[model samples]
Target: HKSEVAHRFKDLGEENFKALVLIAFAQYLQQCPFEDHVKLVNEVTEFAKTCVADESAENCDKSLHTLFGDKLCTVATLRETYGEMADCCAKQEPERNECFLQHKDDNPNLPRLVRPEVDVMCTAFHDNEETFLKKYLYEIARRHPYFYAPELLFFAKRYKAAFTECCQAADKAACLLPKLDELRDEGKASSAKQRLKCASLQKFGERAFKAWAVARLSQRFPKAEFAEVSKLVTDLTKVHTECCHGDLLECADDRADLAKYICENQDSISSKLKECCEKPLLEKSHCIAEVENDEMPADLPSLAADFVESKDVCKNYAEAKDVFLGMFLYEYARRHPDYSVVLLLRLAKTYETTLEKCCAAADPHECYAKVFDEFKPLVEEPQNLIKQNCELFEQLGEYKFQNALLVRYTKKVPQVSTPTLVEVSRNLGKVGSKCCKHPEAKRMPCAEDYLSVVLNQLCVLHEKTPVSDRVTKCCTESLVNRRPCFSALEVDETYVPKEFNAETFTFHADICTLSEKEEQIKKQTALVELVKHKPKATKEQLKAVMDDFAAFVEKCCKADDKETCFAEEGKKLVAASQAALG
Candidate 1:
């Protein structure tokens, strides 16, 4: 059965396998209903002319305008969140779906929703439950585009109950208004935890936090030599302080060093890391950051050993809270390999929020006891996206795979200049190139990590006008939710790609005189030119064009009619290749 299953996976060709594994992984992640997965997975490979890509918004089920509000939900947000998601928006179903779930926070300045007076609500409910419920959701949804269906359901269920219970009260508005107000304010406290955690940084200062980073990194990466770990801790902690302080410039600058540090140790570090070890500096950082965590050893103690704080929370937190929570996060994050540092940071921030809450609780211990389950759901996150990428990567091989990704991103965000898109796609293809050599455990992280890195780089690059404006809108979004933001991008209608100059498509008699290997190399150069010039061409289209050139060589290069044949066929070949570009 195991052997049979291997070929079940093996025999499925690249495109089919991409579909199978991506859909399966989506199922594996439990990101959404089976129906959503089936529909979304089909569009992952589509490009306009079939160049560019299928719009992520069309592929995903969410209404972006309904989700983020009018101004907050824009093309740039969609491009960043969901744009070129070949990497899970399985490139993974869950990560993308989870990415979808994340879009709510990207626009943190959500327009506040004012609940209609309780009297208006009960009258509307009495008049028509169906229409009133629709009205309720629209009003809430308009202002709160971030609300997931479940979140909305949670809101709806409470509102229905509130109106149901309170409307029956002798004094309707009095009972209902207070209940509605409480419901309105429910999630606001979540931020308090983050605010409190940052307060720790401000109060306890950098030394304490750096100590925590050391403990966290060392524990998370058990095989990393302690010296490498120390460097990593330094690289990460600086960014943590800056980012937590909302200093984007310092955060980006410090994170660049972490990228550089990872690159310097490429071969010396995680096997998954070497995938992007050769990419451009910005791209390399994204590839490294996107990698999944080290598998925690089995003998490791439960989270309580590291996580539970039985003593005065703030006092201990202030004393060496970084180290305490560092050990805890190391324990918690390693156990959940799906948790990226992005997710871990989120989990840590949330934990800090709860810790802050309990520190001030009237009964601190009671508040402390309930902190465990607050954010554990983050453990759910990616797989199919990686499998799909590897499937296509293996099928497309290195060159074509790179081009396809380039085409996908170009179509997805034509607003960004071509060089940026080309560099980013090339890096993602490397993930495909190197990651497949690893086991699924190691492979998936590199695959996902590379994607995470690319998007973050795009976020930073978003500072440029046109590019930055769209990008800032997107990159400001959470990595978790950014897929939907990108998935929502509409293809740019105005940015037409320049036509390929056909210079490379022409072949000469001298090309034939070269040894077989050298001749083949010349063909490769042609391919590189074609792909560079024509990012829109698909694999099948390019392959057929390559075949025409190969045929032209087979027929005329060694023949007596060489010059005549060259004149006749070279023109035809160039013409055909031009057709391929379209």
Candidate 2:
């Protein structure tokens, strides 16, 4: 059969033909276990015997169905579209794999994957374990071309092991289905890895990224012509142009648009992606975005374990510290996909801050030795605070959310005046409203950006003496992370103002006579002054005073002698607030 296949493509040199077959078979074996690889010669020989036996797609269909069963949707799609590739193989372009992919361009919509019932699988597995296990992997491999081969193999092995356990159980479906759900739960981390890849690819180089895409897409879509697959690879790269760079919501939106292009146009890309295409457009993007990337056969070397320390990173990155350290973050981030990308960014800035201190010193080597260890713990609280603030921003909305920011900042930095606090709140509130629009994972950078703008302003505004210790720490610690430092400060527990203003507390005759806007402004000014005078008051206590004061005004302002009524009720209102403050 090998000799026949060789004879069939004799015009194409043996080594090149060998590579194309190796690539095609490599696609088929993404789900094959390490041990199962030994047995593939027999399967390869079988496929080779018929795949090139005749020029027609009918012969190709026979080989496909024979080599891979009709159980999976990809097998169906492959059987249909594969003839297009045989036609290319016969036509013989300069680049065979690329040519093969281009010929597959005209293939129709892919068939959706449909899993057999657990009972059916159990019976099949019981009859022949090898075939059933291969089928399990084949189903995964066919539908999910982007899944890392080892991961697919692991899941296949897991299914194999679990099937043995469940086949003997009283309720096969119950036992088996639960384990499948466990695998599904594990599906969520794919996007983080992909997102990290985007940042890394964009930051580092495109050639390696494109090379990887070539291998992954080609192996995943054997029926696809190389030219068509090359186009897909380019389009996929284009998807990442928006991906790692900016405005995550729109990046995701743009990715899905290209994802639709890749999936809908290339039906042979992956049958699983076809399922996403069937979904609503928005969900389809997320679905496509979240699919696991195919594992690179030749692993990319990791960034140096101590790139920060090697040859004084301080000296190397002194010019474009951000650019170099950014690559560091990008590399570490892709490796640490389970961790939040934003948190990792925070850590990189921490890396920068620690370096800024040590790098400036006479003894940087010793200073740098323990930097990352100490710097690592710094962002935990700030990271949580960012999440909390965004949640608050979403819940309370812009106007009230601004007040929430004001309340937090004012409580923590009580010495700051009411006017400054109001300015800070209004600005930070605007930041959160704008930044928090993204989903949680992508919200951090935007939130950090705008929030820091407000914090920087506030820090400068109160840089003078009389600022609280917390304010000093946030302001002095790290300029890059000033906002996060401020965010993590504890509220001032000892901020009980010793003196209250009796003059501002008194209501005037102008309150009853002024327009609604003017009257509202007058009361607002008074309330700010009261909070300024008594910054330690809790929300409940302050609300009580406002409720009482408003009621008193409602009664007194309408009375026959407004001046007499104010002198009586206003004194009581002031006294009630004084009692509440204490």
Q: In terms of lDDT, which candidate is strongest?
A: 2
Q: By summed lDDT, which 10 consecutive residues of candidate 1 come out lowest?
A: 46-55
Show how many residue pairs clash in every candidate, following the order shown: 29, 10
Q: Indicate the worst ten consecutive residues by lDDT in candidate 2.
A: 65-74
> Candidate 1's residue-wise lDDT over 313-333, tens digit each?
566776776555665565555
Residues 1-582, model 2: lDDT tens digits: 433343434533433333233323434433334344434534454545455655443335432322232212223344354645443333322343334334322213436557678888788889988666655555444444333433344455567778888889998888988887666444423423543365447544675465445544443444444566667667777766644432222354466668667666645555446666776543555556445432222454634445644765777779777456645554555444333434565566667777789888887777777666664565456556667877877787786576555656666777777767766667677667776776655455456435544555566567754467677777766443555576567877787763766787787666888986477556655656666677777888876887797788888888788888888878877776677677
lDDT of each: 0.55, 0.57
Best by TM-score: 1
TM-score of each: 0.39, 0.38
Q: What local lDDT score does residue 106 receive in model 1, on the 0 to 100 scale? A: 28
